[PDB]
Design an enzyme around this catalytic site. Sequence first.
Site, mmCIF file in Angstrom:
data_model
loop_
_atom_site.group_PDB
_atom_site.id
_atom_site.type_symbol
_atom_site.label_atom_id
_atom_site.label_comp_id
_atom_site.label_asym_id
_atom_site.label_seq_id
_atom_site.Cartn_x
_atom_site.Cartn_y
_atom_site.Cartn_z
ATOM 1 N N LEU A 21 -3.767 -2.669 -2.599
ATOM 2 C CA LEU A 21 -3.123 -2.269 -1.209
ATOM 3 C C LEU A 21 -3.775 -3.288 -0.350
ATOM 4 O O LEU A 21 -3.325 -3.578 1.011
ATOM 5 C CB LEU A 21 -3.878 -0.732 -0.859
ATOM 6 C CG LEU A 21 -3.292 0.276 -1.720
ATOM 7 C CD1 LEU A 21 -4.122 1.466 -1.126
ATOM 8 C CD2 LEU A 21 -1.809 0.367 -0.803
ATOM 9 N N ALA A 25 -14.701 -7.904 2.815
ATOM 10 C CA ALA A 25 -15.837 -8.795 2.280
ATOM 11 C C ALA A 25 -16.253 -7.884 1.225
ATOM 12 O O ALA A 25 -16.818 -8.602 0.227
ATOM 13 C CB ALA A 25 -16.787 -8.929 3.639
ATOM 14 N N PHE A 26 -16.473 -6.749 1.291
ATOM 15 C CA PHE A 26 -17.344 -5.844 0.241
ATOM 16 C C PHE A 26 -16.532 -5.191 -0.885
ATOM 17 O O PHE A 26 -16.984 -4.593 -1.862
ATOM 18 C CB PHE A 26 -18.118 -4.938 0.832
ATOM 19 C CG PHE A 26 -18.980 -5.578 2.100
ATOM 20 C CD1 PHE A 26 -19.514 -6.491 1.873
ATOM 21 C CD2 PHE A 26 -18.937 -4.854 3.280
ATOM 22 C CE1 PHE A 26 -20.836 -7.062 2.738
ATOM 23 C CE2 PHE A 26 -19.861 -5.559 4.223
ATOM 24 C CZ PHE A 26 -20.762 -6.479 3.896
ATOM 25 N N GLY A 27 -14.980 -5.218 -0.782
ATOM 26 C CA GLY A 27 -14.448 -4.801 -2.082
ATOM 27 C C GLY A 27 -12.865 -4.919 -1.979
ATOM 28 O O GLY A 27 -12.246 -5.342 -0.981
ATOM 29 N N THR A 28 -12.302 -4.454 -2.949
ATOM 30 C CA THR A 28 -10.748 -4.413 -3.057
ATOM 31 C C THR A 28 -10.037 -3.009 -3.140
ATOM 32 O O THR A 28 -10.794 -2.324 -4.018
ATOM 33 C CB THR A 28 -10.158 -5.237 -4.454
ATOM 34 O OG1 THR A 28 -10.944 -6.612 -4.097
ATOM 35 C CG2 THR A 28 -8.698 -5.414 -4.373
ATOM 36 N N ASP A 144 -17.530 -0.330 12.860
ATOM 37 C CA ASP A 144 -16.268 -1.055 12.770
ATOM 38 C C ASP A 144 -15.240 -0.359 13.041
ATOM 39 O O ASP A 144 -13.993 -0.577 12.172
ATOM 40 C CB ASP A 144 -16.416 -1.894 11.351
ATOM 41 C CG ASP A 144 -15.561 -3.049 11.147
ATOM 42 O OD1 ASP A 144 -15.017 -3.587 12.409
ATOM 43 O OD2 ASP A 144 -15.161 -3.523 10.114
ATOM 44 N N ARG A 148 -7.432 -0.904 12.260
ATOM 45 C CA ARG A 148 -7.120 -1.279 10.783
ATOM 46 C C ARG A 148 -7.977 -0.063 9.820
ATOM 47 O O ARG A 148 -7.782 0.011 8.684
ATOM 48 C CB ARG A 148 -7.434 -2.665 10.395
ATOM 49 C CG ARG A 148 -8.816 -3.134 10.780
ATOM 50 C CD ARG A 148 -9.667 -4.088 9.681
ATOM 51 N NE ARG A 148 -10.269 -3.532 8.554
ATOM 52 C CZ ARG A 148 -9.878 -3.963 7.313
ATOM 53 N NH1 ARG A 148 -9.304 -4.835 6.966
ATOM 54 N NH2 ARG A 148 -10.638 -2.972 6.511
ATOM 55 N N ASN A 149 -8.794 0.385 10.479
ATOM 56 C CA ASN A 149 -9.858 1.647 9.752
ATOM 57 C C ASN A 149 -9.474 2.844 10.036
ATOM 58 O O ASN A 149 -10.430 3.761 10.092
ATOM 59 C CB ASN A 149 -11.405 1.052 10.053
ATOM 60 C CG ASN A 149 -11.437 -0.264 9.516
ATOM 61 O OD1 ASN A 149 -10.924 -0.807 8.563
ATOM 62 N ND2 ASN A 149 -12.459 -1.090 10.133
ATOM 63 N N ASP A 162 -14.046 3.747 6.392
ATOM 64 C CA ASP A 162 -14.903 2.318 6.554
ATOM 65 C C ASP A 162 -15.996 2.386 7.355
ATOM 66 O O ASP A 162 -16.133 1.381 8.030
ATOM 67 C CB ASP A 162 -13.776 1.163 6.701
ATOM 68 C CG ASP A 162 -13.208 0.722 5.542
ATOM 69 O OD1 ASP A 162 -13.449 0.982 4.348
ATOM 70 O OD2 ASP A 162 -12.268 -0.368 5.451
HETATM 71 C C1 LIG Z 1 -11.696 4.341 -1.363
HETATM 72 C C2 LIG Z 1 -11.649 4.055 -0.166
HETATM 73 C C3 LIG Z 1 -10.071 3.845 0.375
HETATM 74 C C4 LIG Z 1 -10.069 3.206 1.659
HETATM 75 N N1 LIG Z 1 -8.699 2.919 2.055
HETATM 76 C C5 LIG Z 1 -7.865 3.760 1.868
HETATM 77 N N2 LIG Z 1 -8.039 5.119 1.675
HETATM 78 C C6 LIG Z 1 -6.910 5.828 1.461
HETATM 79 N N3 LIG Z 1 -5.545 5.667 1.544
HETATM 80 C C7 LIG Z 1 -5.375 4.265 1.878
HETATM 81 C C8 LIG Z 1 -4.071 4.021 2.070
HETATM 82 C C9 LIG Z 1 -3.660 2.840 2.303
HETATM 83 C C10 LIG Z 1 -4.693 1.762 2.513
HETATM 84 N N4 LIG Z 1 -4.185 0.622 2.762
HETATM 85 C C11 LIG Z 1 -5.035 -0.671 3.341
HETATM 86 N N5 LIG Z 1 -6.307 -0.762 3.419
HETATM 87 C C12 LIG Z 1 -6.482 -2.092 3.936
HETATM 88 C C13 LIG Z 1 -7.344 -2.837 2.922
HETATM 89 C C14 LIG Z 1 -7.153 -2.304 5.146
HETATM 90 C C15 LIG Z 1 -5.036 -2.692 3.990
HETATM 91 O O1 LIG Z 1 -4.068 -1.694 3.251
HETATM 92 C C16 LIG Z 1 -5.811 1.993 2.364
HETATM 93 C C17 LIG Z 1 -6.375 3.494 2.038
HETATM 94 C C18 LIG Z 1 -11.069 2.911 2.323
HETATM 95 C C19 LIG Z 1 -12.559 2.963 1.958
HETATM 96 C C20 LIG Z 1 -12.649 3.531 0.811
HETATM 97 O O2 LIG Z 1 -13.848 3.705 0.476
HETATM 98 C C21 LIG Z 1 -14.468 4.888 0.765
HETATM 99 C C22 LIG Z 1 -15.964 5.012 0.188
HETATM 100 C C23 LIG Z 1 -16.561 6.009 0.518
HETATM 101 N N6 LIG Z 1 -16.196 7.070 1.177
HETATM 102 N N7 LIG Z 1 -16.625 8.234 1.838
HETATM 103 C C24 LIG Z 1 -15.724 8.636 2.600
HETATM 104 N N8 LIG Z 1 -14.708 8.014 2.678
HETATM 105 C C25 LIG Z 1 -14.810 6.800 1.821
HETATM 106 C C26 LIG Z 1 -14.058 5.792 1.598
#
Ligand SMILES: Cc1cc(Nc2ncnc3ccc(NC4=NC(C)(C)CO4)cc23)ccc1Oc1ccn2ncnc2c1
Length: 289
Positions: A21, A25-28, A144, A148-149, A162
């Site tokens: 997706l 800086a900190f992950g994919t 942040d 985007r977040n 994020d």
């Molecule tokens: C597992 C995870 C997922 C996400 N992101 C997405 N999540 C869900 N659906 C999505 C759909 C599309 C996109 N697209 C997209 N994101 C970009 C890289 C910016 C560009 O394109 C991203 C998500 C962010 C953070 C994350 O990590 C944690 C860790 C711990 N916790 N605790 C509570 N919440 C979290 C979240």
Amino acid sequence: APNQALLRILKETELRKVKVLGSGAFGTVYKGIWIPDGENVKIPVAIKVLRENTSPKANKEILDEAYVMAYVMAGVGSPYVSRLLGICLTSTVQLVTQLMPYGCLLDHVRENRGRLGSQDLLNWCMQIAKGMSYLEDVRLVHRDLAARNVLVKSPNHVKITDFGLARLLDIDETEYHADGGKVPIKWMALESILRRRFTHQSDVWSYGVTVWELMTFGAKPYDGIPAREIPDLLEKGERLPQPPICTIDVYMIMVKCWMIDSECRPRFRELVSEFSRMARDPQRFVVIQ
Ligand SMILES: Cc1cc(Nc2ncnc3ccc(NC4=NC(C)(C)CO4)cc23)ccc1Oc1ccn2ncnc2c1
Ligand SMILES: [Cl-]
């Protein structure tokens, strides 16, 4: 009933990555499928894999904060803040949440520049304020906030993600990556730029920039202005211009978010009440074509 002090561990065999997706800086972040063993369900998920060549000091700081917030938020979450479903441990740390199938709000508004509704834009402003009011209530600073977040579950429903992530990257002379990334100067309160002070009131500034991104259908704030010039133009009183679709009532809230005096900025609870009033009477506040 999940046990709030325990951590749900997903076996690698229960997860499949389908698509990259994006990254930071900190992950994919991957789109994936979670198929819990001994059940007959499939759950669309996002999987964030923490970067392997990040400094171990940095990855401990990031994961420790993730755990602290996960346990704080286990007792009761918010519909408007992303929820950790579990972690998968291989050679890597993989954090798993429910997939938000309309993706990033920034991408959603840029892709639909034409055809987004006034009521939806204001409702998203309200829901983002509700998510931020929850984070403030459980004493968590985002650090942040940006379009985007914010993620789009549906046109009816967005979630902040994020939060409590952004930090200085610990680096070494020879080992690990030294890519801390660009400082998001153009979203930051002046005190965050000048003193690295991050508070609920600097989150309010970033909320103002996020609302500006939504109301401009994802314009880039201070586009073409070198980062070094930003603090001086803010102190001189220059600000992002009024989005064409907005009434002065909406812009006045944005401008209050960008007060140099952090104590003159709105509270997130006030932003919830203001955007709830405006989302109820959208024709009074936002006009699209
Ligand atoms: C597992 C995870 C997922 C996400 N992101 C997405 N999540 C869900 N659906 C999505 C759909 C599309 C996109 N697209 C997209 N994101 C970009 C890289 C910016 C560009 O394109 C991203 C998500 C962010 C953070 C994350 O990590 C944690 C860790 C711990 N916790 N605790 C509570 N919440 C979290 C979240
Ligand atoms: Cl601009």
